[PDB]
Amino acid sequence: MNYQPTPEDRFTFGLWTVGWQGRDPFGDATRRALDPVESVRRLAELGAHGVTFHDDDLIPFGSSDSEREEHVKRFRQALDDTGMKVPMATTNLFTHPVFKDGGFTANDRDVRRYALRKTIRNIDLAVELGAETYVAWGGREGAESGGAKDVRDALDRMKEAFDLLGEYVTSQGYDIRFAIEPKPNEPRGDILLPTVGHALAFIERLERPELYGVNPEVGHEQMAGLNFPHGIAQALWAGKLFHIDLNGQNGIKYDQDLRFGAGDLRAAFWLVDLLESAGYSGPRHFDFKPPRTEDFDGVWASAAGCMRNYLILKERAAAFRADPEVQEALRASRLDELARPTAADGLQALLDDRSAFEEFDVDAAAARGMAFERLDQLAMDHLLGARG
Amino acid sequence: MNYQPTPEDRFTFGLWTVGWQGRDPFGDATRRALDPVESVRRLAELGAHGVTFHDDDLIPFGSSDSEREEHVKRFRQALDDTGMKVPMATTNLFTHPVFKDGGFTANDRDVRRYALRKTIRNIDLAVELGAETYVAWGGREGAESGGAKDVRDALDRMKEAFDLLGEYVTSQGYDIRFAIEPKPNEPRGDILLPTVGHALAFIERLERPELYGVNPEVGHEQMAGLNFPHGIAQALWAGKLFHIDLNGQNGIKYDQDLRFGAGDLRAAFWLVDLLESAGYSGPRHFDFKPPRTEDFDGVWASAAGCMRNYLILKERAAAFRADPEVQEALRASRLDELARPTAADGLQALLDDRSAFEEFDVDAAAARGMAFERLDQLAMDHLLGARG
Amino acid sequence: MNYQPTPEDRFTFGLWTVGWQGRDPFGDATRRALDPVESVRRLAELGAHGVTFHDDDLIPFGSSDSEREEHVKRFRQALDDTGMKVPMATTNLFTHPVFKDGGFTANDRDVRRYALRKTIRNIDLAVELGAETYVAWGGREGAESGGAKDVRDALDRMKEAFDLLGEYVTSQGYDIRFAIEPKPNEPRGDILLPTVGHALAFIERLERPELYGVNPEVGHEQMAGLNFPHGIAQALWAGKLFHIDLNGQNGIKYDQDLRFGAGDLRAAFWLVDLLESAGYSGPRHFDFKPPRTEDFDGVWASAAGCMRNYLILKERAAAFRADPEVQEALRASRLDELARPTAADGLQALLDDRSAFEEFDVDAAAARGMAFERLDQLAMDHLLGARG
Amino acid sequence: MNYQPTPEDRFTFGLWTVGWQGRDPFGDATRRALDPVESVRRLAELGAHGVTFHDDDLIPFGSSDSEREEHVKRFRQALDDTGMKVPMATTNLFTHPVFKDGGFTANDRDVRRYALRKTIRNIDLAVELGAETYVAWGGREGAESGGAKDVRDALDRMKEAFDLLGEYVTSQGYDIRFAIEPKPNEPRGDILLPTVGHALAFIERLERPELYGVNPEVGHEQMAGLNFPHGIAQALWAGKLFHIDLNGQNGIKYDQDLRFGAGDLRAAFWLVDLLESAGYSGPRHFDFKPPRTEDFDGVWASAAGCMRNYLILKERAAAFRADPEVQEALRASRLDELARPTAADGLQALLDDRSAFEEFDVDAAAARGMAFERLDQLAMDHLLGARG
């Protein structure tokens, strides 16, 4: 009963994950830099489907158009030699000191304009490489103090930036969509569009809402103590789940970027159950960092672990849903009634329905148990492979 | 330099705040019940503008149409004798055991129908009493376990419920709007529409979005570690801040419901600054609980404290914004540039602008300090009244 | 491969767990009261070893010495008829309004004296029933505001109370030990002795430290975002783990009291691994609350779930430790070197050892991978029963 | 009414605070390195009393004994030219890749030995420079996964390390004490001795407990959602507050290191009140980082802000305690009774005292209000300078 991934599983990794050198706020790098070409080859051997990148991961910042073309060619050759795809790309608008107060929402106008040009340049490259989704993580859009940022003006600037990107994409006739990646904090004290909900609401104010979706990350929502599977269901409900970032996080603290499966294991189970049940067909992207305690063999073991854990959880969720005893427990808990309209009969009928109020036996209804604990223990038994 | 409130300040209190008996999950009541009429009179003496209520605060659950009319008449007389208004009303869809799995999203269909009828009945009463806003806090809409609730179906049921309420209001020609009150958790393990952002996004999927807004609470957003003033700015930006609940909370833990001003004091300062700067003209409603350590004299002192703290903060925020030294610091930090469009010149102009990329001096821009610390210390000095 | 508990497993339950009526801060009870005798019989059928109680769970507050003797006799008969033991007892110094500001640390002296007499009376009863451990949870010792409690004076009062209890126990020649149960908050804004560490440190200042230990609870430490297994290891290291409370908690929020196994599943695995490896022989006590969504059948299913989950985890931890591949991975990660003294050779030898500094190759040491990710994936595979 | 600091105020700064270049996990440095000599001179001009250092801040890692003597001489001359003192020093056992799994608790024995030699070398230097306290922050002592560290063995290694350091200090006849600095997490997933309480408890197991105390940091305890003033009171109660680190933190998230006064303002007020009331005479040390948005002028403004905020709070706390109306409110809330022994009359007298149980009127006692809200509003008015 093994769990070997194949490119058909659509597992992708960012170059910066497996390529993280181990530098954290309190320590120096513990691993040497990885050549993107090497990463592509190693990931392909592990069974990955593709890779993603920030412009600066692929092309060192400040590169000449000559070196730039050279880095792209090398990368292209690696993709051709392995069959790896690049379904998503993004811009690095957070590392360089110039973005210390943000990219799209920097107080300095000239920085905002530079941010847009840097993004547009990489959008062209993304399309050339076949990316279908372009992610935007405003890691520097935010503040550490209240008067440093008028949030209403910042949201005006954020909308202006995304509206312009939408105009560019449309004018070039590109077949690419945007996904906003929310995060509540870190590296800024508080970051704008802190959760999936804030990002969804913001999108509805853009000129062309259909071009934008969300790219939620497990750890990000968990940094706000939120239920990740619940947030993903809302994004799916709105038809906005364009991409997803998978990793592990142990509660409310710094962003750990643990391999997927680590952190909140039951939440990972419920997330996989939802993604598979809902038919999500986008990439299963891992944005994680192999701990700095590891050498390169630990890096690859960590990456393989991500995929393995997703596949084990997929098997367990499928068995849970396919179990007749579980199907009967779902009915006992009335999940079937939850899916039925409350009043398909209409408003007037509801108002005239005496069984809905005047003659409703509130005490009999209140005495009915939901049987949620037995259902949950069945879910637990399935997760642990203890069904008998 | 005192701070006496007057009804013109629009401070309102829920009957259940000052009327909280002190029963918590680990202890019995420490105070006797308050007659709503008494609360109305005491609050009027303190300078309040009005009160709010859940149907069950005013009319004991299970009351006959006869007793019901009697309770309303008494309340009306109290309002007439004091000049107090009732700008907001809401339904109690959380106390009675029948709502143990929710009201609008209960798995049991018959409960959902009952929830709608109970709400509609109180909407009629709210209009009669002159309420302009009707709040909905789905405290029981949620779960403690993953399989107990299919969130996509629950959101379908939530939309159905709000859509029906919107149809009812329109058909009756009522001049009343709805405000959804989000909360991340408690009493449920996780509650649906957990933050202001989730509520805003949800509203955009309703049939008549213009009839719905949000009713955010200080403590609620802080339970998710979020920046309350930031969330309020987004709601204002979207034009959805129909009402607001003020209180105090010390971090991520159970909902404390401390008096306004307590908890995160600087966040309270920044919230007041924003509300006043943006011209919010709705009620300043306090949803708090005087601690159970207090007797009735402590209850009124706690209520008076809420208003006093808001007025002190209002004075300090106004002085901060009116201070020429602060106005110069805002310019030094480029808040003025944040308010200017990034590219009013248009996309094509931006693409052709060499100063935006090809000739942009990234190192000179990066070296500019934001001067945010001096600005923040000026804000601190103003808050503490230490300006000299 | 089933998991049936037997009294030999030492699983115990508090009368108040399975007996919780479902009253929370926002709702009324959803279940009728359970007769303690009924609980004893039902728990015995499920395979429990014993029960625990607060004085007020067994004897209604304010009972006459006559009724008191009657309640005890009935309970005794239930214990005799089932073979159930009562290894731990505690006092309720939190429900009654008189303890609104605490028991042992109430500002009112007369309340503190009453608290001690109420405790002493139940200590006598506990010994009579054969309890070996007496737990103290100061749920009301704390504050919501800074000036309400001088913490240094409160700690003086806390020590005075425990010192007197120690004097009483010694003078009566009782064979019973005390266990302090820490909690960071709820129902008070902040509670004194908030974590296992604070409780351990406090104990070292008591007159007879050997009579006191800690009674940590999974959910409590997790409310402060702490690693429960780590805290338990420190308590074991100090030889102070006299008792332990098991349950489930999903992060930093109100105390959920979910059944054991729910909440942080991996932390539960690591806790069981530690308890079994260290040879903890005290009771495996469950302090949890079956959710108020449940009827009585759900209550018993929830209680059975606690025991089942502990037994599944025990099996998985044992297999993990017994796996030769894991034993080799532990060596690869140098857990064996962690157990060896750093300098059994002594200070002077260390100072004279050139290989420890002057000739130590810091770069070669730094390049060694810890191989922690492979080890953790082996732990994950074992937990999920995916070893192959 | 200004607030100018003077060296008599005992404000100290770590070289690494004002010297932080701005490199965070997601970005490069935004400021050039500061020469320690320059920092000493700038801080002296601002009114600081002294500075502190990690060995590696003063002497670049890997320096020859020649360069080492050169760096120390330059530093000494700066101290002599300014009158600045160096009351505390510490070791950097976290930056270099060799400490990726810890220093004192690394699984590799050779690393642990190296850690001790590096520490001992800097202890000699600290004494030479006149430091009275030697701090130890085990930032790398911990783990990201459960099987990576046996906590009981790690605590054995931790005790061994501190015991050896204590033996060294005693054998050299040095007049210096150690202070353990706890932190719950970051950079490790979970760090050993996570809070003040854990550190206090650990100290009681050392061979010479009198040589060790704690060095708590505002932000650290707040990362676990704990009440900092409460933790400081316990450390004072135990006589273990040897040093203290001041800064600002906004809730549970990454360690922000905001200037003191920022973050939780009311907690800062209560901390200052306690330190001054208790007569703490050690340094008021600031371990903070001026945000990376700032240039050098912002760095000095941020440092000056720390001192200014402490002095404003000191003034407000003193006025609060000196206010007769507050003194009467303290009596109304019975803070005076909290300071009186519960039973100086002894155990037997308490048992025979019928007014303590048999004849105690529990209902009359329960009805007494604590008057805590009025007291807290008086504290608020004083903090805000709104007393009239």
Q: What is the CATH number of the domain that holds C64?
A: 3.20.20.150
Q: Residue with structure tokens 């036996």?
A: A361
D255 annotated among ligand-binding-site residues? yes
Identify any residues that bridge with C50 across adjacent strands, giving them in sequence order.
C12, C85
Whether the CB-CB separation of B299 and B290 falls below 8 Å is answered with yes
Q: In which region does residue D47 sit, left (phi positive, over 0), alpha (psi from -120 to 50) or beta (all else)? A: left
Q: What gap in Å lies between CA D162 and CA D37, rounded to an integer?
A: 32
Neighbours of B4 (CB within 10 A): 11
A264 catalytically annotated: no
A245 annotated among ligand-binding-site residues? yes
Which residue type, as a one-letter code, is found at position C73?
A: K
A297/C264 CB distance under 8 A: no
Selecting among C9, C49, C54, C56, the annotated active-site residue is C54
- Tell me, what DSSP letter sits at residue C95? S
Q: Cα A36 from chain centroid?
A: 22
Alpha helices in chain D (DSSP H): 15-18, 36-46, 55-58, 65-82, 109-128, 151-171, 196-203, 218-222, 228-237, 265-277, 296-322, 324-332, 335-338, 347-352, 362-366, 372-384
Q: For the residues of B85-122, what is the DSSP string, one character each?
A: EEEEEE---SSSGGGTT-STT-SSHHHHHHHHHHHHHH
Q: What gap in Å lies between CA A158 and CA A138, rounded to an integer?
A: 10
Q: What gap in Å lies between CA A320 and CA A310, rounded to an integer?
A: 15
CA neighbor of A95 nearest in space, from A61, A47, A53:
A61
Identify any residues that bridge with A277 across adjacent strands, giving them in sequence order.
none
Can you read off the two tokens belonging to residue B151?
């969130």
Q: Residues B64, B70, B72, B75: what is their CA dihedral angle, to the nearest 10 degrees?
A: -140
Q: What gap in Å lies between CA C221 and CA C203, rounded to an integer?
A: 18
Q: From the list C3, C293, C366, which residue is nearest A30 (CB)? A: C366
- Tell me, what DSSP letter sits at residue A269? H
Can you read off the two tokens belonging to residue D62?
């890997």
Alpha helices in chain A (DSSP H): 15-18, 36-46, 55-58, 65-82, 109-128, 151-171, 196-203, 218-222, 228-237, 265-277, 296-322, 324-332, 335-338, 347-352, 362-366, 372-384
C221 contacts: CB under 8 Å, gap ≥ 6? C195, C196, C227, C228, C231
Q: Does A101 touch chain D (CB under 8 A)?
A: yes
CA neighbor of D329 nearest in space, from D272, D277, D377:
D377
Would you call D72 helix, strand, or coil by DSSP? Answer: helix
Can you read off the two tokens belonging to residue A353?
């329905």
* Peptide bond preceding B187 in cis form (omega within 30 of 0): yes
Q: Does D386 touch chain B (CB under 8 A)?
A: yes
Residue D214 C-alpha, separation from nearest chain A C-alpha, in angstroms: 21
C184 contacts: CB under 8 Å, gap ≥ 6? B253, C190, C191, C194, C195, C220, C223, C224, D224, D225, D226
| H-run or E-run covering A179 | strand A177-180
Q: What gap in Å lies between CA C271 and CA C314, rounded to an integer?
A: 10
Q: What gap in Å lies between CA C34 and CA C23, rounded to an integer?
A: 14
Q: Does A70 touch chain B (CB under 8 A)?
A: no
**Burial profile A113-152: b = 16 or more Cβ within 10 angstroms, e = fewer:** bbbbbbbbebbebbbebebbbbbbbbbbbbbbbbbbbbbb
Specify the experimental method: X-ray
Whether the CB-CB separation of B251 and B221 falls below 8 Å is answered with no
A197/B192 CB distance under 8 A: no
**Burial profile B217-237: b = 16 or more Cβ within 10 angstroms, e = fewer:** bbbbbbbbbbbbbbbbbbbbb
Q: What gap in Å lies between CA B376 and CA B211, rounded to an integer?
A: 38
End-to-end distance of chain B based on CA atoms, in angstroms? 18
Residue B344: C-alpha distances to residues A109, A215, B358, C214 (Å): 11, 29, 20, 66
Q: What gap in Å lies between CA A196 and CA A233, rounded to an integer?
A: 11
Q: Does B120 touch chain A (CB under 8 A)?
A: yes
C158 contacts: CB under 8 Å, gap ≥ 6? C104, C105, C138, C141, C192, C193, C202
| H-run or E-run covering A212 | strand A212-214
**What values do phi and psi take at B146, rounded to 5?**
-65, -40
Q: Does B24 touch chain C (CB under 8 A)?
A: yes
Contacts of C341 in chain D (CB under 8 A): 160
- Beta-strand pair C85-90/B133-136: unpaired
Question: Closest chain A residue to D98 measured between Cα atoms?
Answer: A30
User: Sheet harboring B133-136: ordered strands across?
Assistant: B212-214, B177-180, B133-136, B85-90, B50-54, B11-14, B284-286, B245-246
| H-run or E-run covering D98 | none
A161/B379 CB distance under 8 A: no
| H-run or E-run covering D133 | strand D133-136
B262/D262 CB distance under 8 A: no
Question: Closest chain B residue to A278 measured between Cα atoms?
Answer: B152
**Burial profile C273-308: b = 16 or more Cβ within 10 angstroms, e = fewer:** bbbeeeebebbbbbbbbbbbbbeeebbbbbbbbbbb
| H-run or E-run covering B231 | helix B228-237
Whether the CB-CB separation of B161 and A343 falls below 8 Å is answered with no
CA neighbor of D14 nearest in space, from D133, D109, D106, D123:
D133
CA neighbor of D346 nearest in space, from C168, C173, C155, C211:
C168
Q: What gap in Å lies between CA A36 and CA A18, rounded to an integer?
A: 10
Whether the CB-CB separation of D303 and D34 falls below 8 Å is answered with no
The number of domains in chain C is 1
Residue A174 C-alpha, separation from nearest chain D C-alpha, in angstroms: 30
C176 contacts: CB under 8 Å, gap ≥ 6? C123, C126, C127, C131, C132, C133, C134, C169
Q: From the list B154, B226, B379, which residue is nearest A147 (CB)? A: B379
Q: What gap in Å lies between CA B310 and CA B12, rounded to an integer?
A: 12
Q: Which of B254, B315, B384 to mutate to test the interface with D (most CBs of D within 10 A)?
A: B384
Q: Does A279 touch chain D (CB under 8 A)?
A: no
B86 contacts: CB under 8 Å, gap ≥ 6? B50, B51, B52, B53, B79, B126, B129, B130, B131
Whether the CB-CB separation of C141 and C192 falls below 8 Å is answered with yes
Q: Cα B152 from chain centroid?
A: 26
Neighbours of B300 (CB within 10 A): 18
Residue D9: C-alpha distances to residues A358, C336, D83, D317 (Å): 73, 50, 14, 16
Q: Which of A94, A107, A144 to mutate to test the interface with D (most CBs of D within 10 A)?
A: A144
- Tell me, what DSSP letter sits at residue D8? G
- Beta-strand pair D85-90/A177-180: unpaired
Q: Return the axis-axis angle of helices D296-322 and D265-277, rounded to nearest 10°.
A: 60
Whether the CB-CB separation of D152 and C273 falls below 8 Å is answered with no
Cβ burial of C222 (10 Å; 0-12, 13-18, 19+) is buried
Can you read off the two tokens belonging to residue A196?
């999936």
Say how many CA atoms lie within 13 Å of C149 toward its Cβ. Answer: 30
Q: In which region does residue A385 sit, left (phi positive, over 0), alpha (psi from -120 to 50) or beta (all else)? A: left
| H-run or E-run covering C306 | helix C296-322
Domain holding D183, by residue range, is 1-388
Chains that touch C (3 or more CB pairs under 8 A): A, B, D
Which residue type, as a one-letter code, is found at position C149?
A: K
A49 catalytically annotated: no
Q: What gap in Å lies between CA D179 and CA D166, rounded to an integer?
A: 12
Contacts of D27 in chain A (CB under 8 A): 94-97, 99-100, 140, 187
Whether the CB-CB separation of A223 and D254 falls below 8 Å is answered with no
Q: Does B25 touch chain C (CB under 8 A)?
A: yes
Whether the CB-CB separation of C53 and C318 falls below 8 Å is answered with no
Q: Residues A318, A323, A328, A334: what is their CA dihedral angle, to the nearest 10 degrees?
A: -10
Q: What gap in Å lies between CA A97 and CA A103, rounded to an integer?
A: 11
Q: What gap in Å lies between CA D25 and CA D33, rounded to an integer?
A: 18
- Beta-strand pair D190-191/D142-143: antiparallel
Whether the CB-CB separation of A140 and A94 falls below 8 Å is answered with yes
B28/C262 CB distance under 8 A: no
Cβ burial of D273 (10 Å; 0-12, 13-18, 19+) is buried
Q: What gap in Å lies between CA B250 and CA D384, rounded to an integer?
A: 19
Supply the Cα-derived Rg of chain B in whole angstroms: 23
Residue C254 C-alpha, separation from nearest chain B C-alpha, in angstroms: 4
Whether the CB-CB separation of C30 and C51 falls below 8 Å is answered with no
Whether the CB-CB separation of D235 and D199 falls below 8 Å is answered with no
Q: In which region does residue A62 sit, left (phi positive, over 0), alpha (psi from -120 to 50) or beta (all else)? A: left
Q: What gap in Å lies between CA D245 and CA D223, rounded to an integer?
A: 14
Residue A76: C-alpha distances to residues A70, A84, C11 (Å): 10, 10, 61
D265 contacts: CB under 8 Å, gap ≥ 6? B265, B266, B383, D383
Neighbours of B136 (CB within 10 A): 24
Would you call B38 helix, strand, or coil by DSSP? Answer: helix
For Cα atoms A171, A174, A179, give the angle at the middle one, nearest 5 degrees: 105
CA neighbor of A177 nearest in space, from A216, A131, A141, A217:
A131
Q: Would you say the C-alpha torsion B96, B101, B104, B109 has a positive or negative sign?
A: negative
Contacts of A302 in chain C (CB under 8 A): 373
End-to-end distance of chain A based on CA atoms, in angstroms? 18
Q: What gap in Å lies between CA D144 and CA C213, rounded to an integer?
A: 28
Alpha helices in B129-227 (DSSP H): 151-171, 196-203, 218-222
Neighbours of B169 (CB within 10 A): 20
Whether the CB-CB separation of A146 and A190 falls below 8 Å is answered with no
Residue C81 C-alpha, separation from nearest chain D C-alpha, in angstroms: 34
Whether the CB-CB separation of D94 and D183 falls below 8 Å is answered with no
Q: What gap in Å lies between CA D306 and CA B29, rounded to an integer?
A: 44
Supply the Cα-derived Rg of chain D in whole angstroms: 23
- Please note each residue after which chain A is broken, C-to-N distance over 2.5 A, or write none: none
**Burial profile D246-261: b = 16 or more Cβ within 10 angstroms, e = fewer:** bbbbbbbbbbbbbbbb
Selecting among C56, C57, C264, C273, the annotated active-site residue is C57
B250/C95 CB distance under 8 A: no
| H-run or E-run covering B187 | none
Q: What gap in Å lies between CA C302 and CA C313, rounded to an integer?
A: 17
Would you call D199 helix, strand, or coil by DSSP? Answer: helix
Cβ burial of A364 (10 Å; 0-12, 13-18, 19+) is exposed
Q: What gap in Å lies between CA D108 and CA C368, rounded to an integer?
A: 10
Can you read off the two tokens belonging to residue D194?
């996570």
- Tell me, what DSSP letter sits at residue D34? P
Q: In which region does residue A263 sit, left (phi positive, over 0), alpha (psi from -120 to 50) or beta (all else)? A: left
* Peptide bond preceding C187 in cis form (omega within 30 of 0): yes
Query: How long, in residues, is chain C?
Result: 388
* Peptide bond preceding D187 in cis form (omega within 30 of 0): yes
- Tell me, what DSSP letter sits at residue B197? H
Contacts of D25 in chain A (CB under 8 A): 23-25, 186-187
Q: What gap in Å lies between CA B312 and CA D57, rounded to an integer?
A: 45
Q: For the residues of A51-95, what is the DSSP string, one character each?
A: EEEEHHHHS-TT--HHHHHHHHHHHHHHHHHHT-EEEEEE---SS
**Burial profile A249-274: b = 16 or more Cβ within 10 angstroms, e = fewer:** bbbbbbbbbbbbbbbbbbbbbbbbbb
Supply the Cα-derived Rg of chain C in whole angstroms: 23
| Residues 147-166, chain D, touching A (beta carbon < 8 A) | 148
Would you call A24 helix, strand, or coil by DSSP? Answer: strand
Q: What gap in Å lies between CA D78 and CA C106, rounded to an integer?
A: 54
